[PDB]
């Protein structure tokens, strides 16, 4: 007895699953990179941080991880990685981090 605006609801569900996935990836990768920064493995750490930043910006392309908020996540990731490698040294791969 209702109107077909239920269609909107359906779409949201799809979009929901689309978003939760991307974020769930980003978070995961971030953690991974930070681990390698704590253990001193700088090459792999930066190599994974590059992919994390890429996934962040790709999520920002759509309505999932829009706005800056994406820049916020990128900033926090790069800061934490550079800080943890400074506790060990030798930024081997020279990836996302500026000279």
Partner RNA sequence: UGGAGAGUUUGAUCCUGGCUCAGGGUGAACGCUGGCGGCGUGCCUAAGACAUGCAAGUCGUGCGGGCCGCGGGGUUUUACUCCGUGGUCAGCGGCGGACGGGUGAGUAACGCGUGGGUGACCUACCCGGAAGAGGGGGACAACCCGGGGAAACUCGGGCUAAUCCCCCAUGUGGACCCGCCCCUUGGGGUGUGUCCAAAGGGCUUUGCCCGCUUCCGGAUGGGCCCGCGUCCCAUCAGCUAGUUGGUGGGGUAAUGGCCCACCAAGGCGACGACGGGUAGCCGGUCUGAGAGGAUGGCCGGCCACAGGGGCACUGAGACACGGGCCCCACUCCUACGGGAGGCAGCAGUUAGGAAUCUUCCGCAAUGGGCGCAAGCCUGACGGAGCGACGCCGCUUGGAGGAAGAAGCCCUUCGGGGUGUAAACUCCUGAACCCGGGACGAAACCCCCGACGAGGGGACUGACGGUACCGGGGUAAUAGCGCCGGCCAACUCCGUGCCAGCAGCCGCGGUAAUACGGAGGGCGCGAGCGUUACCCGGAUUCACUGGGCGUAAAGGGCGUGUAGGCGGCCUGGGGCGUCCCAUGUGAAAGACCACGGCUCAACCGUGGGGGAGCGUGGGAUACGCUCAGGCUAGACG
3-class secondary structure, 52: helix
- Residue 54 Cβ vs Mg ion, minimum distance, rounded to whole Å: 9
- Residue 88 Cβ vs RNA, minimum distance, rounded to whole Å: 15
Task: Enter the tokens of residue 47.
Answer: 């190599």
3-class secondary structure, 88: coil
Contacting RNA within 46-85 (CB under 7 A): 50, 53-54, 56-58, 60-64, 66-72, 74-76, 78-79, 82
- 2 touching Mg ion, by CB under 5 A: no
**∠ CA(8), CA(13), CA(19), 5° rounding?**
120
The residues binding Mg ion (CB under 5 A) are 4-5, 7, 28
């Amino acid at each position: 007895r209702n109107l077909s605006a239920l269609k909107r609801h359906r779409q949201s569900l799809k979009r929901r699953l689309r978003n939760k996935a991307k974020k769930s990836a980003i978070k995961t990768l971030s953690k991974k990179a930070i681990q390698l920064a704590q253990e001193g493995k700088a090459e792999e750490a930066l190599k994974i941080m590059r992919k994390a930043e890429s996934l962040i910006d790709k999520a920002a392309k759509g309505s999932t991880l829009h706005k800056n908020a994406a820049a916020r996540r990128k900033s926090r990731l790069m800061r934490k990685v550079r800080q943890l490698l400074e506790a060990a040294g030798a930024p081997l791969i020279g990836g996302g981090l500026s000279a």
